[PDB]
Design a protein around this ligand. Sequence first.
Ligand SMILES: *[C@@H]1O[C@H](CO)[C@@H](O[C@@H]2O[C@H](CO)[C@@H](O[C@@H]3O[C@H](CO[C@H]4O[C@H](CO)[C@@H](O)[C@H](O)[C@@H]4O)[C@@H](O)[C@H](O[C@H]4O[C@H](CO)[C@@H](O)[C@H](O)[C@@H]4O)[C@@H]3O)[C@H](O)[C@H]2NC(C)=O)[C@H](O)[C@H]1NC(C)=O
Length: 1161
Amino acid sequence: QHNWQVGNEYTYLVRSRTLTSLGDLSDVHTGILIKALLTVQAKDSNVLAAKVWNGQYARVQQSMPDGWETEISDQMLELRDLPISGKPFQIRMKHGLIRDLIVDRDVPTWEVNILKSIVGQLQVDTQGENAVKVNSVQVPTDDEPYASFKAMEDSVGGKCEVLYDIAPLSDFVIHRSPELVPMPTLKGDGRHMEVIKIKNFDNCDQRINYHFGMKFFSRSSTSRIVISESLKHFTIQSSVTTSKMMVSPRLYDRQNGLVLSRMNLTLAKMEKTSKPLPMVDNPESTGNLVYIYNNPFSDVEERRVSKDFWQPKPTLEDAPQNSLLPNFVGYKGKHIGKSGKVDVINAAKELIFQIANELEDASNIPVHATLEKFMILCNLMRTMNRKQISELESNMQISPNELKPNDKSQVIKQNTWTVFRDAITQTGTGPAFLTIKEWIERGTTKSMEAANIMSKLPKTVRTPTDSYIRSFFELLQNPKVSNEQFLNTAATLSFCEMIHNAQVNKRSIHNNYPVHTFGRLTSKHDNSLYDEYIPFLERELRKAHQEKDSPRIQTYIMALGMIGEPKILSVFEPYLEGKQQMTVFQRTLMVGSLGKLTETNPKLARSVLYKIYLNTMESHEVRCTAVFLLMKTNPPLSMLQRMAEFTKLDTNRQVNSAVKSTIQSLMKLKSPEWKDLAKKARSVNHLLTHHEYDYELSRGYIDEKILENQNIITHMILNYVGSEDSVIPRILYLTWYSSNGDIKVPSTKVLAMISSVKSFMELSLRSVLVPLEGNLMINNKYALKFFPFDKHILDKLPTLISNYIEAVKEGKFMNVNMLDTYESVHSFPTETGLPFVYTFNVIKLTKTSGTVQAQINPDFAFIVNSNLRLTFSKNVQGRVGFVTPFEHRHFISGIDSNLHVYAPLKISLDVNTPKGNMQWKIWPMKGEEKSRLFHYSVVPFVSNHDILNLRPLSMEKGTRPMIPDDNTSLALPKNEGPFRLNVETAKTNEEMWELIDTEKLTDRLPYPWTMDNERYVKVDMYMNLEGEQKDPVIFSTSFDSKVMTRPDTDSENWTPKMMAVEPTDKQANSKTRRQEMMREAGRGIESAKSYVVDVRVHVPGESESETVLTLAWSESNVESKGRLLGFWRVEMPRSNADYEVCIGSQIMVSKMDFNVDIRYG
Ligand SMILES: *[C@@H]1O[C@H](CO)[C@@H](O[C@@H]2O[C@H](CO)[C@@H](O[C@@H]3O[C@H](CO[C@H]4O[C@H](CO)[C@@H](O)[C@H](O)[C@@H]4O)[C@@H](O)[C@H](O[C@H]4O[C@H](CO)[C@@H](O)[C@H](O)[C@@H]4O)[C@@H]3O)[C@H](O)[C@H]2NC(C)=O)[C@H](O)[C@H]1NC(C)=O
């Protein structure tokens, strides 16, 4: 109860430290230490006077072999003053506990947070004031040092549950450690005690964190407090806290990233007061001991303190207000642009110009670190308002309508436009969306560029509010978007995806957006959805159905499907029942669009899908979809039992094959997710039919790849619906997961459909009832795309091809660039009072540049002289660390990786229609004789840099890569050759990397996927003098008329044994390929017209390898199939290897084909 006495002055020693490290990889730590003093005076019953006055801190980047808890003498540290004002403040007490603090208004919020952390260690609850219904058991106690209750205490990390335990202190411990009891004469007639607190962060009331994504963290807070005489009238002697955070840097590693912290107080003096502390000027309450936010863009301090501790909802003109990320609280708790050394507009301009200039020298992209610059730019523009964006756009003089993209002189301008467009697409704020809206309104972006812009918005928006969606709706109503067919689909799908992820799915609402910083994004009282949006889509669907336009119907069906609200069932009801006519493809799309309803409302979705299944009058491509969808809802045992029993009397082969394959393949699933369903499938197996179906029928299939060593499970779900006319199935479902622990990366799913394969084949052959309909969908982490098509687009395609051919006659220049990013941030305060930041980034690039000119002739000579460049890069960054606002510094431990592919090449295709000769030529271009073609490095590091400097970390003097002591280097090409390969791996014992590079073992696997992906590697594949090559790499391909002989077809014996035609194909010549063409086509010719495709791949130079190939067969319904073809003979002109592997298949059964494996020489 009475922790303190009136008229006494307590002096405490303050010690703390916060460090980051790479874990078991290295023993190098980066961080800071703090030393200070705390003075507390008890002047009244519930009024305390406090002051923290001495302040010193130092930065450490060392190796700590013994441990992070070791003492470091002041003679080994460079100490600096801590910019905190030693202004007195007041602590208000209630029932022996800390209630709130009173601080002068002219004090920064970060200082208030540090004081919260310091004072939170004086909070001892011995009488169970924060009762958790366990203090009643402790009530009948009298002089009992033992107590093991539970409570709910206050700390900078939040207001979370804490476990208590009290027991007396023995004299042996005190003798070993005099540090615990500085002055021991204060116990008087009592005894010493120990209090241990263990903090649980799972269940908790007040939470403060920032999130954006789509449990790997590990928090552990413990305390150790020693108190003097009595459990009611005592004195605090020492208090220490210890916290630890563990993160896997790249989501698939062994949890190596650490952040550690501690706070320390030891009593120094206690004596009667002589001079009192001055009263607090300009008082104001700071709430409880929990972290508080700030206004980043305000000139004066503005604290949101509960008495709702929540930042205001983002608007559509001003920047969002966050208080846990480096760009918002780095500069003394305020915005970075307030520094003066940083002007946002000029920084953005310089970064854009640098990125645009560096894209011309693509072979040096990894060296210059362009993609890291792109990420820095995207981070920087999230702190801009619309006025600043408009000023920047006007200042860079961008007018793509005026600019000519086809001119080689104007390349940097187009690159600036491209980089700026990509950066705004990835910004994700309100001003960015206003900028995009203004662009589309005026006409700066028209069809495909705008469709690409809209395709990425749902995957990059961070704060989807009501105003954001209202503006999106207003944009959807625009004449320009509505009239264009391609832009409309992208815009509508993105709108519906955002609606769903922001309002419908509670899991999406809570676990994907920073709710604990801004509150719930959309108020539950907003009836805008049901009164405005869904009726609009219903009207549009009705109009589209009336006019009989396939792509519009498909777009609105997908749009209503992706919402996932139960009202879409009433929306779809008139079409499903049969009052309104609809085709089978459209009905299948409607039934498959119900996927997100199964995730959110499993019972109702199960009811409707089972009702669809039980009907025997629906087409099989409806019921198969119903089966494939039901098993995503975890049915009960009776359901599966009845479904399995149904197979005996069911009269459809497709449905039975679907259910049997799904149930049988649902057995081997020994995973934490499908365990119960696997057991149910095992229990029901003994009732399925004994009939077996061919692989051409509809079948589902699930792959489980469980790896105990890697602790990662990879899944693979494949559903396809067979057809009664062609072997190729009509509909294909494909999905890839990647689960490690509990967190999963967003999945990649592909959907392909077509109404009739025979119709598609007939249209394809003609170019050289049920309408032709089809669509393709790719939904991955980067964008959502949907291409629906009808017969009109198929008939328009040849016109576009002819127009392109006639337009590239004189010569055309092309410049296509593409940039994509992926983000995931997680931030929360530590137990010292400082932000903790975790980031995971991926950046991609696909650049295709060069001049292309063609020619077409009445002789059908499609003569082309192409000249291209090809590039692909990928950067992956994973970082963990913390920020110190009082010096704008950021401490990072992480691993970065790179991958780079460059394809400088020149092509001359001379394909002739009358005679199937398509002779290519591949050259190295002039001035590019020596160039880099490959790069792959993985680099772990510890960094200590300044936020005001917007530069890649590789150029910062504080960064330190982890180079092993015994690093070595290898140059694989033994002597002079065409190719140069370097490996700069280290430790001479990685084995998995220096064995795949041996290139002398035949059994060695060339695949490098199976390797340790956490080590310093660096590989470069250069090229020395392959250029200036007059001799080309001939790639000549011939063709055959595919004739057949009737006498040989009749009375032709069929045997499983396969003969070898190698002696007949001894001559490896394209001209001699005509001689061998008759033998290959003639063999096994039973009313079949099969041609031969012979390629003569020839490589000139010092080493020549005349690789040859032959595919001579075709698929015919009348024929018995079985392809006899294939031989790869490689001859060295100097030392002939004569590697001549051959294959073949003459089974002629339509069931095992006998294939010869190899034959050497
Ligand atoms: C919370 O913070 C407080 C201080 O803010 C820490 O208290 C300190 O704890 C350390 C370690 O327990 C103490 O260090 C020990 O000091 C002893 C006395 O130092 C000298 O004192 C005088 C000079 O003033 C000399 O005349 C005398 O002869 C002593 O030499 C040392 O004897 C101890 O030596 C230990 O280390 C050496 C070298 O490794 C070994 O050879 C020894 O065998 C022995 O293990 C030791 O250095 C320090 O005194 C404490 N400070 C105070 C003010 O009491 C708490 O430890 C901290 N809490 C946590 C959890 O870290």
